[PDB]
Design a protein around this ligand. Structure first.
Ligand SMILES: CCO[C@@H]1C[C@@H]2CN(C(=O)[C@@H](NC(=O)[C@H](C)NC)C3CCC(F)(F)CC3)[C@H](C(=O)N[C@@H]3CCOc4ccccc43)CN2C1
Ligand SMILES: [Zn+2]
Length: 95
């Protein structure tokens, strides 16, 4: 079937609902994370992408979830369709 890792998390609205217990101390906001395909897994500040199942943690002030998505998980289909291969190639070219 579908390549999507977590079908229940395919909508922005559903991803946002997972952030009810997101610690307010974390400098990155639920809106920025959910927009970039991430949902909260309920431990610390751990998030996973609904499409590629890539996990990120230890968010710091000034982190851009889209940039982090492209840095670590460049072949994610959701990332490529939302931001484009040109964006992914640019981020990848920094490393
Ligand atoms: C073999 C290839 O490994 C790459 C490295 C990259 C780092 N990363 C991360 O999440 C990194 N986070 C960041 O870069 C954050 C978003 N900005 C500072 C790590 C930065 C150093 C640290 F010590 F703080 C720990 C977080 C992710 C990560 O550590 N994810 C963990 C491990 C796998 O399981 C989960 C599950 C949920 C959430 C996170 C993770 C994915 N990693 C792949
Ligand atoms: Zn992804």
């Amino acid at each position: 079937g579908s390549s999507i890792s977590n079908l229940s998390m395919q909508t922005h609205a559903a991803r946002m609902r997972t952030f009810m217990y997101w610690p307010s101390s974390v400098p990155v906001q639920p809106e920025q994370l959910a927009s970039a395909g991430f949902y909260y897994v309920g431990r610390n500040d751990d998030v996973k992408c609904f499409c590629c199942d890539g996990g990120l943690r230890c968010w710091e002030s000034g982190d851009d979830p889209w940039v982090e998505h492209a840095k670590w998980f460049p072949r994610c289909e959701f990332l490529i369709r939302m931001k484009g291969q040109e964006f992914v190639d640019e981020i990848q070219g920094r490393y």
